[PDB]
Amino acid sequence: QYIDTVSGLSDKKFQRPQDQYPPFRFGTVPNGSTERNIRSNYRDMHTHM
């Protein structure tokens, strides 16, 4: 079988941002509105974003 096209936000590949050959993107266009939302509580993402 092929890989599963991983699901929404809380999927296993994201909340473990220690990875360099996963889906390696978190593009999130610079200075955008959703640039702030990823600076709310959890520095887990904004560090690899």
Partner: protein
């Protein structure tokens, strides 16, 4: 088996109305925006190796 199904956190524990209840809570916040605590993880959360 997949992903988590109930969210929560960790934390220090202190008897109610202890004096340090304020300064302690502070140095944790400072450590997140600083980047020390986050960089600490790799040293003990090292690679996958599998």
């Amino acid at each position: 088996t997949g992903e988590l199904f109930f969210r929560s956190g960790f934390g220090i524990g202190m008897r109610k109305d202890s004096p340090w209840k304020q300064n302690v809570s502070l140095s944790i916040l400072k450590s997140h925006e600083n980047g020390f605590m986050e960089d600490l993880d790799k040293t003990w959360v090292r690679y996958q190796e599998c």
